[PDB]
Amino acid sequence: MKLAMIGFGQAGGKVVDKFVEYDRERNAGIVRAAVAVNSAKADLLGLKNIPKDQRVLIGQSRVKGHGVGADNELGAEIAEEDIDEVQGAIDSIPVHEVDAFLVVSGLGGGTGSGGAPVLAKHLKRIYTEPVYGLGILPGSDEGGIYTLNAARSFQTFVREVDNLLVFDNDAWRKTGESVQGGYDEINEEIVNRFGVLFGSVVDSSEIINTLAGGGVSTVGYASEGVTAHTTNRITSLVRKAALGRLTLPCEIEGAERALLVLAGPPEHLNRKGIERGRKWIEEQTGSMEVRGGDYPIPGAEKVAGVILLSGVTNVPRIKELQQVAIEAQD
Numbered sequence: 159m160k161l162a163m164i165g166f167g168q169a170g171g172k173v174v175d176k177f178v179e180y181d182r183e184r185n186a187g188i189v190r191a192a193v194a195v196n197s198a199k200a201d202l203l204g205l206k207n208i209p210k211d212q213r214v215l216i217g218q219s220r221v222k223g224h225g226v227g228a229d230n231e232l233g234a235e236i237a238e239e240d241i242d243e244v245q246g247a248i249d250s251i252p253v254h255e256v257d258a259f260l261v262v263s264g265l266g267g268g269t270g271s272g273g274a275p276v277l278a279k280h281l282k283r284i285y286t287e288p289v290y291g292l293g294i295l296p297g298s299d300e301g302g303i304y305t306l307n308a309a310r311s312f313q314t315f316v317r318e319v320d321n322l323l324v325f326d327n328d329a330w331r332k333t334g335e336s337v338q339g340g341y342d343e344i345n346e347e348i349v350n351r352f353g354v355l356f357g358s359v360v361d362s363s364e365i366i367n368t369l370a371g372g373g374v375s376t377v378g379y380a381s382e383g384v385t386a387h388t389t390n391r392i393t394s395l396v397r398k399a400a401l402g403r404l405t406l407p408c409e410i411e412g413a414e415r416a417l418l419v420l421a422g423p424p425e426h427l428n429r430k431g432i433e434r435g436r437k438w439i440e441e442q443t444g445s446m447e448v449r450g451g452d453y454p455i456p457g458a459e460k461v462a463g464v465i466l467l468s469g470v471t472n473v474p475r476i477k478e479l480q481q482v483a484i485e486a487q488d
């Protein structure tokens with residue numbers, strides 16, 4: 159699937175940057191365009207893979223290149239005031255050549271938290287391709303203000319995209335490590351999962367149709383190196399992905415639609431594993447629709463299974479954020 163990726167804020171920027179590197183290393187053809195938007199000048203300079211002409215500094219009149227800290231209200235205001243700066247950069251993207259936009263951002267801060275939903279709304283207003291969000295939730299160790307920002311940002315972001323894919327840092331914390339060291343490993347985990355998803359063969363239509371019901375999505379993932387053997391290995395990965403740690407933890411029962419993706423060398427893929435996998439996923443989810451296919455990749459030394467679950471509900475983490483936002487209103 160061909161994406162226009164826009165990273166918003168420091169986290170969104172680093173994730174999109176890594177996505178570009180991943181896509182390039184594997185010749186995956188995923189990141190057709192990459193743009194980074196920030197109010198902190200130093201953050202944009204630190205990027206490695208996003209073209210300098212696609213790094214947009216906004217809010218100069220308000221924060222003079224110094225960021226908005228964790229003031230997401232100000233983040234939303236600068237995104238609204240300076241949306242034409244962002245559009246300036248987007249105008250260089252060959253939009254006719256993309257299947258969808260993806261707006262990537264941490265929700266706990268200020269620039270991305272406030273600006274990502276503003277951008278998503280702007281994009282849906284002028285383009286007709288789907289606009290998805292990838293929202294990254296904060297660690298519970300960061301502090302109450304970051305949780306509150308995320309709660310408020312989530313409420314708005316989910317309403318402005320066609321679907322909000324979620325990755326929760328709190329479920330993926332790396333304990334013994336430095337903050338930045340933790341983010342480097344987390345960003346690898348993020349890109350390996352969504353990179354496999356966006357990479358009979360699964361086409362973009364199947365992804366778009368899986369996401370079309372809107373709301374929140376979560377991704378399961380398992381991988382391993384290296385006819386019954388093939389089938390059983392596949393069904394095992396499917397189980398490991400469904401029961402393993404999700405990008406956003408939740409009960410998978412009640413998901414609206416599911417998509418199974420198997421990626422690997424053709425000789426270690428077959429139809430039977432995928433068909434059994436789809437039935438098993440339906441048993442575990444009760445999903446309305448369960449699609450499944452593969453990404454044949456010659457020369458690959460790993461097989462990876464990804465399950466995309468769209469329209470998940472009764473998610474404790476989401477119910478927490480809603481409660482957090484509601485209390486702060488009152």
Ligand SMILES: Nc1nc2c(ncn2[C@@H]2O[C@H](COP(=O)(O)OP(=O)(O)O)[C@@H](O)[C@H]2O)c(=O)[nH]1
Nearest residue numbers: 167168169172264266267268269270271296341
């Ligand atoms: N996965 C990931 N999350 C990050 C990273 N950096 C920051 N975060 C998370 O993103 C939130 C916003 O931080 P940041 O993007 O720097 O703030 P912003 O630039 O004001 O939007 C933080 O509260 C963290 O939860 C990163 O490199 N990777």
